[PDB]
Amino acid sequence: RPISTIVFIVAMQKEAQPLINRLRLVEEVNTPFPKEVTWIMFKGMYKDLNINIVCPGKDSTLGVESVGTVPASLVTYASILAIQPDLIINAGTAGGFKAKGACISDVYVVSTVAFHDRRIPVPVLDIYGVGMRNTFPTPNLIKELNLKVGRLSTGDSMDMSPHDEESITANDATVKDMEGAAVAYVADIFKVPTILIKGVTDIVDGNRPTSEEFLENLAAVTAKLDESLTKVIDFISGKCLSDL
């Protein structure tokens, strides 16, 4: 049976904006979420697909985007149970490692993702900590659209301690972010097809810092990312979860 509905999970609404504009998605007023959360949702029908972009929104106290693994998981759970999707995709900008060939503005399709900041020095619990997992296999996509593939490492810090560096290295990650691994975990319990797409905005093992290189590009890349997601939606439209 063909894919009908696709739920997009984005940490920052800024990252999704362009897509929302090109597809002319409308922000759902009555969200199927609890009256108390700050989550926002944008629904739309592109060709034969019900596209839904859900974002954790802005923190009710600080007024800043609620990034991180905790809000990312809560949202992914709620969305799954609510607008039960056929395919859930986690997109957003990220850190790249040039050592693994990551240029700025590159658009990778995460293959396997794990946690680099959950170090539990215990026999089996340390594997749980890393909690590594696969993404839904989409060879025709990476092939057709000819995209870059790589592993993702997730952590609640935007910086990178020497401890994070060693683990990201043990994960063999090419891209680095703050929520991917968390999303994959939830969708995995409800066993729903999942895809993670990351736009490189900052070269972590590079010279230029991790905070200023990120800002002067969260426009240039956030743009390239959009252009890319569209063509991805465009590719799925009409297919079955296996034709991907």
Residues 140-199 that bind ligand ADE (CB under 6 A): 158, 176-178
Q: Which of the ranges 21-29, 45-53, 58-66, 229-237 carries the binding residues for its own copies, by CB under 8 A?
A: 58-66
Q: Which of the ranges 32-40, 42-50, 88-96, 161-169 carries the binding residues for ligand ADE, by CB under 6 A?
A: 88-96
Q: Rounded to whole angstroms, how far apart are CA atoms 24 and 43?
A: 9
Q: Is 202 annotated as a binding-site member?
A: yes
Q: Rounded to whole angstroms, how far apart are CA atoms 210 and 173?
A: 17
Nearest distance from C-beta of residue 213 to ligand ADE, angstroms: 8
Active site residues: 15, 202
DSSP 115: E
Q: Rounded to whole angstroms, how far apart are CA atoms 27 and 55?
A: 11
120 contributes a contact to its own copies by CB under 8 A: yes
157 contributes a contact to its own copies by CB under 8 A: yes
93 contributes a contact to ligand ADE by CB under 6 A: yes
Candidates 150, 167, 168, 169; CA nearest to 111 is 150
Q: Which helix (H) or strand (E) segment is 109 a member of?
A: strand 107-115
Q: Rounded to whole angstroms, how far apart are CA atoms 209 and 148?
A: 24
Q: Which residues bind ligand ADE (CB under 6 A)?
A: 93-95, 158, 176-178, 201-202, 204, 210, 214
Binding-site residue set for adenine: 176, 202
